[PDB]
Design a protein around this ligand. Sequence first.
Ligand SMILES: Nc1ncnc2c1ncn2[C@@H]1O[C@H](COP(=O)(O)OP(=O)(O)O)[C@@H](O)[C@H]1O
Ligand SMILES: Nc1nc2c(ncn2[C@@H]2O[C@H](COP(=O)(O)O)[C@@H](O)[C@H]2O)c(=O)[nH]1
Ligand code: ALF
Ligand SMILES: [Mg+2]
Length: 195
Amino acid sequence: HMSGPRPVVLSGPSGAGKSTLLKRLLQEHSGIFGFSVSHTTRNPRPGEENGKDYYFVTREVMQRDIAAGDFIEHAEFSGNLYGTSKVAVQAVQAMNRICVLDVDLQGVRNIKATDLRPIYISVQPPSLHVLEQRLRQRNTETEESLVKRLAAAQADMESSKEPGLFDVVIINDSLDQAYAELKEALSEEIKKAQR
Ligand SMILES: Nc1ncnc2c1ncn2[C@@H]1O[C@H](COP(=O)(O)OP(=O)(O)O)[C@@H](O)[C@H]1O
Ligand SMILES: Nc1nc2c(ncn2[C@@H]2O[C@H](COP(=O)(O)O)[C@@H](O)[C@H]2O)c(=O)[nH]1
Ligand code: ALF
Ligand SMILES: [Mg+2]
């Protein structure tokens, strides 16, 4: 489906601030944005809610849906499966809202190959050390997956500099500043959606 406004793809390393920024955006502008609820096989963290943060499913269920053709894209990240189902995006488009997707770098490259035509925004930590500090001060991950996520962060941090890959790169040093720059990147779309 290509009806509705231009979608927004938000990416960046684990722990960079994607969820925090998107939660703020959906709170302030709940009438114009909607969140694509991805499927994942990873376990929920305290406070996460099925059908809101993710559809938390088993690998068997995820695989059956993949085999059925139910996903726009999927990827393996730090030992678990993640994916954007067709219905997750179509539900937001049906409501005439701007669909916001939170995906990894593989997901960005996957979505580039679709007809979705989004704006691509990368959210970056000030440094890898701040990232690790932020990730560990949450400690929702095993050491093994913290290692994998810190490695993927470096690999994907470099690609944020790839010309033409992202439309905007936002360094999340101060959350208030990053959130202003998020809305700046979307200001024309927000104005159109409001009028
Ligand atoms: N500007 C900031 N300064 C300090 N800590 C932050 C900032 N933004 C987010 N955090 C913290 O960093 C952690 C990771 O943020 P999160 O939004 O979960 O990252 P992601 O969704 O990109 O994996 C969270 O515990 C959050 O409270
Ligand atoms: N490719 C892809 N990546 C996703 C999807 N949902 C979440 N991710 C990504 O998977 C990584 C891990 O997410 P987390 O486990 O921290 O919630 C993040 O980079 C996040 O953006 C998805 O549907 N598709
Ligand atoms: F989006 Al994350 F760790 F919460 F990469
Ligand atoms: Mg997150």
